[PDB]
Write a protein that binds this DNA or RNA. Sequence first.
DNA 1: CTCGTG
DNA 2: ACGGCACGAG
Length: 255
Amino acid sequence: TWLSDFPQAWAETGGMGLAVRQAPLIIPLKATSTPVSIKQYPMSQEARLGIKPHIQRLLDQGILVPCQSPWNTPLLPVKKPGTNDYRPVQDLREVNKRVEDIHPTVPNPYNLLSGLPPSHQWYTVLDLKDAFFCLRLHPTSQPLFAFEWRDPEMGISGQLTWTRLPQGFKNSPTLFDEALHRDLADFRIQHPDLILLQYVDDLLLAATSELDCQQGTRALLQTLGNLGYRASAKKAQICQKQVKYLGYLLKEGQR
DNA sequence: CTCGTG
DNA sequence: ACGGCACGAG
């Protein structure tokens, strides 16, 4: 009943997350950057109808807000083989080219796994749901990711933008990783016996035995939920000696 | 749809 | 030495 014991920790019961201890993010532009407003290639009604519900949900959650901005990038209707279930995919390439680069601190999976001792064979794998959306964007940086949204009937006039770290932004992975590392620094200190690996939104908790893996997992779940993050109950792999993590199958300390 | 990569 | 062309990705 791991789900019932930690309602606030699961995306299924705790609602959309929000990293309350993290200050809204300010995105520095390169020294020569000036706003660019790229035209929206007219979208077919089909793509527009598949995307509508997603845009409405995001608006209700406050993840998206109306705005007027000198910046504007294309919205694209990416989908599965067919005409069913779409999703809003933004082309932030002209924006990415204009924001100042940061040192990529997220380690590659190979080097990250090398830090897993053979002594810790009891694993718990958690996948944070809508990770980037948990980090707020400072109002001064929000205009940067604006895009056009139209709907014949009543609703919005033109541009919408994000209030949270969006998808497609080149620095989202790194900024989320560093943010979660700051939020879990304490947890690592209070649990010296545990091994916690972080790869953006993919987490692996390692323990010496089955008990302290259960007690540690309870602790991480409690902590994650309190901090405003949300783990997917569906994918969760709790206290197993065999788990799927970052493409590998961990067992006997192999791979 | 628009790019970058090979 | 090209430069059209899958393929991946925002």
